[PDB]
Symmetry: C2
Subunit: 468 residues, 2 copies
């Protein structure tokens, strides 16, 4: 009998089947269409690995050992519920359903409760790493049934990314906390990608760096404090040559990058729960504005943007490293908004997430994997109740040392009419969070004028209204 | 009686006084009759006759056919199963108009539920507070044109009338009326944020005292920034406290949460993929202010040095650069607001006429301005206008006044003054007007780690690369 079952063989579950078999476990498999079930065992016997193939979902359910554990990697839709309903027919008490797809967390909380209304235990697990992380080591974020995580952890611990000793797996928490963490993960991924793209345009359009020089600076930044998966791949991307022309491949890609849904979700949670995430607002704005490509062409023909002529006595020494410090400053700020949202929702949902180990599971396999997340993990284990992360003593010293660089990057781009909303929002976010008095006294005074919303006073309690 | 009104609350109270002032007669009902009692007291004070009722059954039958009922009770489960209960006494051809500020999707359920009984439903957003009630509202009725047809004249003569042309229009089908009202206050949230950032730029860079600030705002209200918010801001900043020796605005605690209204339009922007950065900054400022005891702890750790401005900093004409900068951000703010309206109008197939929407906003609103009459002039000149600052009127204003926006952002950034709405407004403009954006690197990244296909400059088809 098999140890684990896996429904849904895309480019993501296939390689997870190979990983599970590569680590001493052997897996059962089912797909709606059987050509991909055909292709998977093809690659299994190629790599000298055994994977059992099945045509109906019933034969594989009966070919697992109790408690039966099944993983789903099918796309979000009614298909998730037609699989889960039909798995429930054959499943009995104590059996485990593990959803690995990126699903809206409210959907999971609904399905955890329907499935335990049959005492079928549900594990909503977010997976990150793509199809490289699948095959060799991803970042697992399982949440929901603590019982189900305990019976399957051993499969996850040896199939995840190993940072030294540490497997990139941890019990996230109860309910749909697994999808919420993974959702916040791609929110921080969207912001990291936007900040990198804005650093790319500062060097190319102010220091007027060619595409290879940009690849070197990213290969030099990747050697450092911002050593990350995304920074290293930009160095590779910027150096890549097209095979149809003699140009760099990135320069021939049309600048339309829409939102694929997941990352969009984090801004909805931010808005409705009242937790600001400005770095992510700029990231979604950049993606959404790019979609109107033929409106932006008409707009530029009316508002022609001139080539960037830099002042001859503008000083640009250390600007490459000021952008270094600025980018690192904006990443500290970007994670601060993400983890503050996680912390707050953790308290409202009563999940009591451990952000120290969430940072530690994210050190490998995922898209945002960086040495930076080891500083975060060490920060929260030093202070387990830290709300904002740059309030940590080391991080606060990093902000105070590198914030002038962020000011000068925003100043230089502002003067030369280069838009970097993520950089501007990140420094705007810091200046408002760290200010005791904000101009919302005038707003509260305005609302009382026309709407009688009442206001509160500095020196006394109670709500007051005045005829101005 | 000509019209009945079943939930007046504190707001329909004042609506009855106006409706009777112009030759019509109103029936009235409240859940609790202490307020229907109070309504007639003010009715006979102002010398008009208004009918009061205690049960819902007696009031429905006292109007001429087809009987039309208005509801102005707050959003909740009470309104929607009430709609099960109003359906009880109403028959076909009756007109039900919801005037409460309601989520447009919540309405869309009831228009189609009511058309399942051949009772046509009008989701109408009302603005003006209860001053708009007595003297003039901004009516935004949408849904069934037939249902708008029986109440049309009642709205035309009871709204805020700019001369003779009424601030009422058939907005469109479905819940289009509520969506206009929602997007309207979205621009209201952004206008307040842009003004509040102008207030702190003058206070902390030019060291303007509250009286100098009131004069500049009263001097902006005389010019291109003639608006209701600019005029009341001049009054607010000049008002003196009677409890202490300070200005009243300086003794108000800086915590201003969102009451729902502005929060909703940002949800639509995110879910439909229409960027509204000016509105994003407005909600960010409000949401950050609620963490007042976190902002105090953060400031103690990040001591802020006093704003010591360079003695050789040039600040002459800075007051006029901020005028043009603030005006630039208003054009940009409305551009995102009307673009969202334009986009949702075609996604919902409402075929809204934003020229008439802008003209509906000439009276009654918090956002009243002569500025939006020029907006109406833009759409009347080009009904297919995509973005509003691409119009020739605004484009020449933008091209003349955008340099002022650059130096305002530069000066605040230099002295660490946070102006998220100003920074977003100038970022939004530079990207909307850029043919090539750095999102080619993003598409290359997604194809790298996620194997998402991409499109090319010079050719069709979807491509994937082994990088
Ligand atoms: O997601 P994607 O855009 O990335 O494409 P995809 O990788 O090809 O889809 C991944 C998985 O989702 C399944 N799937 C998609 N739509 C389905 C539906 N209506 N009913 C049942 N299964 C469905 C697919 O089943 P199939 O492999 O049978 O298409 C596949 O197993
Ligand atoms: O704050 P605010 O000044 O806006 O409050 P408010 O003006 O006093 O309430 C406005 C209207 O909403 C009605 N309302 C509120 N909650 C209701 C509920 N559960 N069921 C039925 N009607 C309800 C109220 O009925 P009442 O007039 O009976 O309060 C009132 O007519």
């Amino acid at each position: 009998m098999c140890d684990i079952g896996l429904i849904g063989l895309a480019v993501m579950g296939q390689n997870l089947s190979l990983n599970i078999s590569s680590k001493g476990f052997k897996i059962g498999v089912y797909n709606r269409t059987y050509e991909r079930t055909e292709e998977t065992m093809k690659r299994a016997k190629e790599e000298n690995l055994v994977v059992y193939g099945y045509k109906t979902v019933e034969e594989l359910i009966n070919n697992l050992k109790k408690p039966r554990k099944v993983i789903l990697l099918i796309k979000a839709g009614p298909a998730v519920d037609e699989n889960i309903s039909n798995i429930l027919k054959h499943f009995e008490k104590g059996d485990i359903i593990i959803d690995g797809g990126n699903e809206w967390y409210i959907n999971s909380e609904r399905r955890i409760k329907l499935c335990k209304e049959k005492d079928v235990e549900y594990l909503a697990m977010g997976v990150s790493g793509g199809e490289a992380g699948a095959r060799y080591g991803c970042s697992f974020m399982p949440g929901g049934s603590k019982y189900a995580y305990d019976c399957v952890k051993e499969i996850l611990e040896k199939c995840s990314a190993q940072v030294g000793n540490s497997p990139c797996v941890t019990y996230i928490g109860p309910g749909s906390s697994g999808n919420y963490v993974k959702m916040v993960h791609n929110g921080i991924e969207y912001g990291d990608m936007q900040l990198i793209s804005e650093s790319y345009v500062i060097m190319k359009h102010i220091l007027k760096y060619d595409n290879q020089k940009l690849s070197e600076v990213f290969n030099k930044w990747n050697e450092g404090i911002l050593n990350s998966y995304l920074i290293e791949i930009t160095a590779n991307i910027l150096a890549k040559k097209d095979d149809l022309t003699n140009n760099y491949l990135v320069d021939m890609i049309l600048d339309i990058a829409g939102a694929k849904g997941t990352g969009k979700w984090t801004m909805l949670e931010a808005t409705e729960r009242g937790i600001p995430c400005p770095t992510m607002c700029a990231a979604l704005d950049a993606r959404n504005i790019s979609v109107f490509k033929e409106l932006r062409t008409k707009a530029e023909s009316n508002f022609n943007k001139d080539n960037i002529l830099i002042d001859p006595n503008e000083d640009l020494n250390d600007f490459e490293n000021d952008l270094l410090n600025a980018l690192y400053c904006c990443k500290i700020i970007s994670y601060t908004q993400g983890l503050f949202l996680l912390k707050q929702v953790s308290e409202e949902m009563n999940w009591k997430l451990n952000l120290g180990e969430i940072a530690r599971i994210w050190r490998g396999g995922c898209i945002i994997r960086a040495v930076f997340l080891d500083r975060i993990a060490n920060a929260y284990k030093n202070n387990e109740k830290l709300e904002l992360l740059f309030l940590d003593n080391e991080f606060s010293d990093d902000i105070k040392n590198k914030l002038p660089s962020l000011r000068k990057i925003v100043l230089m781009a502002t003067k030369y009419s280069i838009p970097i909303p993520a950089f501007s929002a990140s420094l705007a976010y810091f200046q408002m969070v760290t200010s005791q008095n904000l101009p919302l006294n005038l707003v509260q005074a305005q609302r009382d004028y026309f709407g009688s919303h009442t206001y509160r006073r500095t020196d006394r309690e109670g709500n007051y209204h005045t005829l101005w």
